[PDB]
């Protein structure tokens, strides 16, 4: 033994395994097709910032196989734009790329790669949020009125100013209305009308039955 402890101790800095393990966790919590997983990625990239190498594994670590490919294709394109522009201070004479991104000298490209990657990572057909109203329709036995109200909310919940809601709403209220509903609106003959009329058409949503009073 002769005294404890001994020379030798490599630490390094480039996102270790345990680092990926932790991510896998915080990610495992994320939801399928929600701004939770991807977000966690930016956290890791903003934490230590995994080089190209790390990204490589991270790709075949969290993401799926196929996805890895699709993504691999994304970058190939992204880079195409970079290399094309000659990139800040890239070395096209060298040949490799990830090498430069893993080079403890290039901070301009290294960073660009971090975002570039996340780009493809967020360019996946299921690496972000989604419209919940995209699956919201008036139930055959639901409070159309209340539904319309919510539809508006649930909408604003995922309705970018860049996109219209006034109509989208009238579309989710009608275009996305049960049968008896769609039949009501039509039978009412007020499709191409305001919502106010829609609530006045469902206000009853029932064939008034009566024969003389008293």
UniProtKB/Swiss-Prot annotation:
This is Capsid protein p24. It is found in: Virion. Forms the spherical core of the virus that encapsulates the genomic RNA-nucleocapsid complex. Coiled coil: none annotated. It comes from the Viruses. It comes from Human T-cell leukemia virus 1 (strain Japan ATK-1 subtype A) (HTLV-1). The capsid protein N-terminus seems to be involved in Gag-Gag interactions.
């Amino acid at each position: 033994h002769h005294h404890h402890h001994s020379s030798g101790h490599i630490e390094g800095r480039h996102m270790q395994m345990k680092d990926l393990q932790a991510i896998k966790q915080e990610v495992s919590q994320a939801a399928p097709g929600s701004p939770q997983f991807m977000q966690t990625i930016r956290l890791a990239v903003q934490q230590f910032d995994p080089t190209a190498k790390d990204l490589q594994d991270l790709l075949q670590y969290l993401c799926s196989s196929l996805v890895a490919s699709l993504h691999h294709q994304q970058l190939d394109s992204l880079i195409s734009e970079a290399e094309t522009r000659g990139i800040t201070g890239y070395n096209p004479l060298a040949g490799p790329l990830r090498v430069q991104a893993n080079n403890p000298q290039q901070q301009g490209l290294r960073r660009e790669y971090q975002q570039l990657w996340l780009a493809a990572f967020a360019a996946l057909p299921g690496s972000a949020k989604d419209p919940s109203w995209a699956s919201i329709l008036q139930g055959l036995e639901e409070p159309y009125h209340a539904f319309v109200e919510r539809l508006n909310i649930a909408l604003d919940n995922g309705l970018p100013e860049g996109t219209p809601k006034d109509p989208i709403l009238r579309s989710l209220a009608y275009s996305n209305a049960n049968k008896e509903c769609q039949k009501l609106l039509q039978a009412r003959g007020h499709t191409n009308s305001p919502l106010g009329d829609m609530l006045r058409a469902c206000q009853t949503w029932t064939p008034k039955d009566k024969t003389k009073v008293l």
